[PDB]
Amino acid sequence: MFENITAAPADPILGLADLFRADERPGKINLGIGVYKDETGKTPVLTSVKKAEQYLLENETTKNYLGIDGIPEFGRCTQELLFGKGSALINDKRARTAQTPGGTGALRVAADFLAKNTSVKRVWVSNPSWPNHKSVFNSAGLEVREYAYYDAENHTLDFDALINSLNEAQAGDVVLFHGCCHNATGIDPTLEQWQTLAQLSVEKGWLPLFDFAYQGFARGLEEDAEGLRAFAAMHKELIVASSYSKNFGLYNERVGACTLVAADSETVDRAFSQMKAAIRANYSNPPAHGASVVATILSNDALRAIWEQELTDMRQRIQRMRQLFVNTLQEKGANRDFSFIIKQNGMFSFSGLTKEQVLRLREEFGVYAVASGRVNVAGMTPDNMAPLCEAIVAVL
Amino acid sequence: MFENITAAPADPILGLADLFRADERPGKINLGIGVYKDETGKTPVLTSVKKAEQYLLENETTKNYLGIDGIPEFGRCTQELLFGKGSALINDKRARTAQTPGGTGALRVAADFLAKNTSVKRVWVSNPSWPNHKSVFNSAGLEVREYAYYDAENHTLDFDALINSLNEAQAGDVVLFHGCCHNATGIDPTLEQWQTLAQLSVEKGWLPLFDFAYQGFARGLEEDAEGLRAFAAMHKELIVASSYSKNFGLYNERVGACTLVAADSETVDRAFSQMKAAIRANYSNPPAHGASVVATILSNDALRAIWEQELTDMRQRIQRMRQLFVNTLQEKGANRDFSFIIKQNGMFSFSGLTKEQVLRLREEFGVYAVASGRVNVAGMTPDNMAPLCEAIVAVL
C-alpha cells in the first residue's frame, strides 16, 4: 500500500538547520532560525514561566481531560488581550474562544470549521506570506489566492496594489491578515490603513481571518492590537487565530487560541458548537500544560508584571539589533541603504540580498540565511555584528 | 456567514455529566465517566509522573520547537513497548513513530495521511465501536463500515459473524482493531483468534490499523500486546495509534503516538515523510510536557518500576471491582447471571440493562449510566457497591 508513495518535498528551514549543524567552521552564524534568541544565542525559558510551572507542580491534583474548548480562564484572558477589557464584544458575549495546539492548530481548526459549515471556498493571503498558510488551508480543501502587499523595490507596503488586488475577491471569501509583525516582511499597515481596510472589508462582504502570532513584538500589547480592534469595531463576524509561542517563549508546548466572533450570543454559541465538533474530530481536546502556564501568569498581578517586562526586553532586544545592524552596515562601507530595516517590525525582514549572494555568504563566510534573503534579526548579537556585516559587505 | 449554521448534536457523555452535576441527590453514582478513578473517587496524578515533572522543572533549559515527529527517545521507547525489545521490526528499522496529541490525534493523522497518499477509501470498524472513530475518519473524507463483533445475546465475541462480515471487505481497505480492552465491550480475541485474523488479513489484502489505548489494563504490558505482535510478525505494512492518556493518567496533556510500519527502511522513510507533511498542515509539531514525562519515566529504571506498580494497582482495582460487582449482585438477589462481567477486560462493559432501565436508575435512584447500558467499573467502589446493586436489582 506504501510502495508508490513519493517523498514529500524538503523544507528549506529544517534543511538549512541540518546544513548549519554539519558545518565545521567557527564563525558560523545562523540567521535562518524561526525563534527568538537572546544576547547569548539561546532560547531560554522565561522566568515567569518557570515560576508558573512550579506553582502547577505543587497545586495540580489531576490530569483529567479539559473541555473541548480548554481552560475557561485561558479563554477570557485571551479575549481581553485581543479586544481589551471593557470591549463590547466581550460584554455582549459575541465571542467564543477555543484553546488550540499552537497558532497553527488554531488556523487548521478554523479551516476545517469553515470548510464544513460555510460556503467559503477561497482564502486570500498576502504575497508573500508565511508558507504554511497554503498547506493548512489546502489541507481543508480550501482554495488559496494571493493579494499584493509587499513592494520589493521600495521595501514597503504598496497599499494601492493591495487594495487593487483585493478587488478581485468576492463576497463570502475570506481574507487573511497578520495582526502585526508581518511574516516575513516586518511591514504592517498604519492605523489609518487598517481603518481603511476595515471599511472596505465590510463593504465587500469579506470574512476577515486574523493570524496574530506576535502580539507585543511590534510596539506593545495594546498597540499591536489596534488593527484587529479596528476590524472588530466594524464587523459582525470575525475569526482570530492567536499564538503564545513567541511572546511567552512556549514554542513546544503548543499554546494558541481560535476566537470566533458573531453578531450575537445565540449565533456565536450555535456556530461555536460546530467548531467544537471540528476539534473533537481532530485531537479531541487541548494540551493543558502550556495553556495552564499562560492562564496562571495572566491572572496573577505579580507574575504578569514580570512577564510583561520579559516581553519588553525581547522587543527591545530586536529593536536594538535592527538599529545596530543598519549602523554597522553603513560603517563597514555598505553600498546600499538599509534604513528600511529600522521601519520593519518583529524578528523578520527581507535583506534584499540575492539568491546568489545568499549562497555565497554561506559557502564563503559561514553566514546562514534563507534563499529568499530572509533574515532573523534575533540571530544577531553585539558580538557577531561586525563579522556578519563585513561578510555581507563583501558580497554586495 | 454564520447565520444559518445549525447547532451540532449534543453528545450524551458530556450531557450526562452536566445532568449528574445538577443533581441535588446525595447517594448519586456516576458510571458514565470515561476515565479511571480510584477508591476515593478521584483521578490523581501518578507519583511517577509528579517525580518526572519535578525533574523537568529543574532540568529544562528551553521550550524550543520539537521536531515534527517529536522527542526521539519517546519514539524508541514507544516502539519497544509495542513490539517488545529485540523485535525484528525495530532492528530492521521498518517502523517510524510520530509523537501526537493523544491517541485521537494519532488516529486523525493516520486518516489524513491515508486519505492523501493512498487509495484507501474505506475503513472497517467493529459494531459497536468507540463512537469517535466515525467522526475522525469521516472528517478525513473516508468511508466507514461496520463489522460484526459483539454478541448482545451471549455477551461474547461472535467470531463467526465477525469473519463473515469482514469477507465483504476488499483488498486495500483498512480494518481497525482495538489492541486490547475493546471499547466498550471489554471483549478481546484470544491469542489463537488474533493469529487467525492475522492470517486472514494477509490473505485478503487488508491494511490493519490498531487503536491501542489501554496497554497494561487487560493482563499486562507485554500480554496486552500479543495481538498486535501477532499481526506485526505477518504483515509488511501496519499502522498503530497508541495513547498514554490512561496508562500514565496523562489524559489532558495529550500524549500519544502514530506508528507506521513498512516492508523496509527506505519505504517507511519515504512514507513517513508524507505523514510529517500531514502533521505540519495540522498542528505543526507536538506538545512536549506530556511526552517528556513519558520518555523520562520509561527510560529511568527507578521511575519505570514505580510506574509499572502504579499501573498494576489500576488494573487490579478494576479486576477487583468487576468481581465484587458480580458477587454483590448475586447476594442482593439478582435475577440474571452477570458472570460475563468477570470475563471482560478494562474499564468498560455493557451491563445488559435496557434503555428504560437506565432511565429509571437515574430518575429513581440517582445512578448514572449511558443509555446503551454501558458502565465504567472504575466508577464503582467498595463503599458504593451495595447501594448500586440494590438499585439495579430494583429495576430488573
Burial A358-374 (b: 16+ CB within 10 A, else e): bebbbeebbbbbbeebb
C-beta atoms of B282 and A104 within 8 A: yes
**Under 8 Å between Cβ of A136 and A296:** no
- Of A140, A141, A136, A158, the C-alpha closest to A149 is A158
B289 lies within 8 A of chain A by CB: yes
Q: Name, in order, each residue with C-beta under 8 angstroms of B16's C-beta and a sequence gap of 6 or more.
A: B30, B32, B368, B370
> Which residue spans of chain B are classified as CATH 3.90.1150.10?
11-44+316-395
- H helices of chain B, in order, are 12-21, 47-59, 72-83, 88-91, 102-117, 132-139, 159-165, 191-204, 226-232, 265-280, 288-299, 301-331, 355-360, 385-393
Beta pairing partners, A260 = A96, A239
Say how far apart CA B265 and CA A101 lie, in whole Å. Answer: 31
**B88 burial via Cβ count (<10 Å: 0-12, 13-18, 19+):** exposed
**Under 8 Å between Cβ of A104 and A132:** yes
Collapsing DSSP to helix, strand or coil, B193 comes out as helix
Q: Could you tell me the three cell numbers for A267? A: 449565533
Q: Could you tell me the three cell numbers for A309? A: 517586562
Say how far apart CA A53 and CA B103 lie, in whole Å. Answer: 25
Count Cβ atoms below 10 Å from residue B158 Cβ, excluding itself: 17
User: Pairing mode, if any, of strands A156-157 and A150-151?
Assistant: antiparallel
Q: Report residue A188 CA to chain centroid gap.
A: 13
> Which residue spans of chain B are classified as CATH 3.40.640.10?
45-315
Cα-Cα-Cα-Cα dihedral sign, residues B66, B69, B71, B72: negative
Annotated binding-site members of B for L-aspartate: 34, 130, 183, 374
Q: What would the DSSP string read from start to end of A290-336?
A: HHHHHHHHHT-HHHHHHHHHHHHHHHHHHHHHHHHHHHHHHHTT-SS
C-beta atoms of A139 and B251 within 8 A: no
Burial A262-283 (b: 16+ CB within 10 A, else e): beeeebbebbbbbbbbbbbbbb
Cell 495540522 belongs to B282
Q: Provide the residue type at B16 as one letter.
A: L
Exposure of B41 in the CB half-sphere (CA atoms within 13 A): 10
PDB resolution in Å: 2.1
To 5 degrees, how large is the angle CA B193–CA B196–CA B201? 125
Task: Please tell me what DSSP assigns to residue B340.
Answer: G
Exposure of B77 in the CB half-sphere (CA atoms within 13 A): 20
Residues in chain A within 8 Å Cβ distance of B7: 270, 273-274
Cell 506498580 belongs to B309
Cell 459494531 belongs to B127
Say how far apart CA B282 and CA B75 lie, in whole Å. Answer: 20
Cell 520518555 belongs to B295
Q: Is CATH 3.90.1150.10 correct for A11-44+316-395? A: yes
Count Cβ atoms below 10 Å from residue A101 Cβ, excluding itself: 29
Mutate to test the interface with B, among A243, A266, A284, A376 (most CBs of B within 10 A): A284
For B163, left (φ over 0), alpha (ψ -120 to 50), or beta? alpha
CA distances from A229 to A181, B125, B178 (A): 16, 47, 49
Residues in chain B within 8 Å Cβ distance of A172: 1
CA distances from B91 to B83, B87, B236, B267 (A): 11, 6, 15, 15
Task: Please tell me what DSSP assigns to residue B362.
Answer: I
Q: Could you tell me the three cell numbers for B45? A: 496524578
- Of B111, B122, B96, B274, the C-alpha closest to A5 is B274
Say how far apart CA A301 and CA A297 lie, in whole Å. Answer: 8
User: Pairing mode, if any, of strands A174-178 and B367-368?
Assistant: unpaired
Cell 429495576 belongs to B395
Count Cβ atoms below 10 Å from residue B151 Cβ, excluding itself: 16
Say how far apart CA A42 and CA B283 lie, in whole Å. Answer: 24
Rounded to a whole number, what is the largest CA-CA distance in chain A? 63
ω before B213 within 30° of 0 (cis)?
Answer: no
Q: Name, in order, each residue with C-beta under 8 angstroms of B139's C-beta and a sequence gap of 6 or more.
A: A112, A278, A281, A282, B108, B111
Q: What would the DSSP string read from start to end of A166-221?
A: GGGPPTT-EEEEESSS-TTT-----HHHHHHHHHHHHHHT-EEEEEE--TTSSS-T
Q: Which residues 301-330 on chain B approach chain A with CB closer than 8 angstroms?
A: none
C-beta atoms of A284 and B104 within 8 A: yes
**Under 8 Å between Cβ of A316 and A39:** no
3-state secondary structure A56-77: HHHHCCCCCCCCCCCCHHHHHH
Rg (CA), chain A: 21
Exposure of B234 in the CB half-sphere (CA atoms within 13 A): 21
Say how far apart CA A241 and CA A104 lie, in whole Å. Answer: 8
Say how far apart CA A203 and CA A200 lie, in whole Å. Answer: 5
**B266 burial via Cβ count (<10 Å: 0-12, 13-18, 19+):** exposed
Q: Name, in order, each residue with C-beta under 8 angstroms of A160's C-beta and a sequence gap of 6 or more.
A: none
Beta pairing partners, A258 = A98, A241
Say how far apart CA A279 and CA A109 lie, in whole Å. Answer: 7
Q: Name, in order, each residue with C-beta under 8 angstroms of B306's C-beta and a sequence gap of 6 or more.
A: B47, B48, B51
Pick the residue from chain B with its C-alpha nearest to A11.
Answer: B277
Residues in chain B within 8 Å Cβ distance of A283: 100-102, 104-105, 108, 254, 283
Say how far apart CA B293 and CA B252 lie, in whole Å. Answer: 13
CA distances from A51 to A46, A68, A293 (A): 9, 27, 9
Which CATH architecture best describes the domain A45-315?
Answer: 3-Layer(aba) Sandwich (3.40)
Say how far apart CA A33 and CA A53 lie, in whole Å. Answer: 26
Q: Could you tell me the three cell numbers for A350? A: 527581507
Beta pairing partners, A126 = A147
The backbone torsions φ and ψ at residue A39, rounded to the nearest 5 degrees and listed phi first, read -55, -25
Pick the residue from chain A with its C-alpha nearest to B17.
Answer: A67
Q: Could you tell me the three cell numbers for A321? A: 539589533
Rg (CA), chain B: 21
Count Cβ atoms below 10 Å from residue A258 Cβ, excluding itself: 27
Q: Which residues 152-211 on chain B approach chain A with CB closer than 8 angstroms?
A: 172, 207
Task: Please tell me what DSSP assigns to residue B252.
Answer: G
Q: Name, in order, each residue with C-beta under 8 angstroms of A9's C-beta and a sequence gap of 6 or more.
A: none
Count Cβ atoms below 10 Å from residue A12 Cβ, excluding itself: 15
C-beta atoms of A64 and B252 within 8 A: yes
C-beta atoms of B237 and A5 within 8 A: no
Say how far apart CA A69 and CA A258 lie, in whole Å. Answer: 9
Catalytically active residues of B, by annotation: 130, 211, 246
For A333, left (φ over 0), alpha (ψ -120 to 50), or beta? left
C-beta atoms of A281 and B139 within 8 A: yes
User: Pairing mode, if any, of strands B348-350 and B374-376?
Assistant: antiparallel
**Under 8 Å between Cβ of A92 and A263:** no
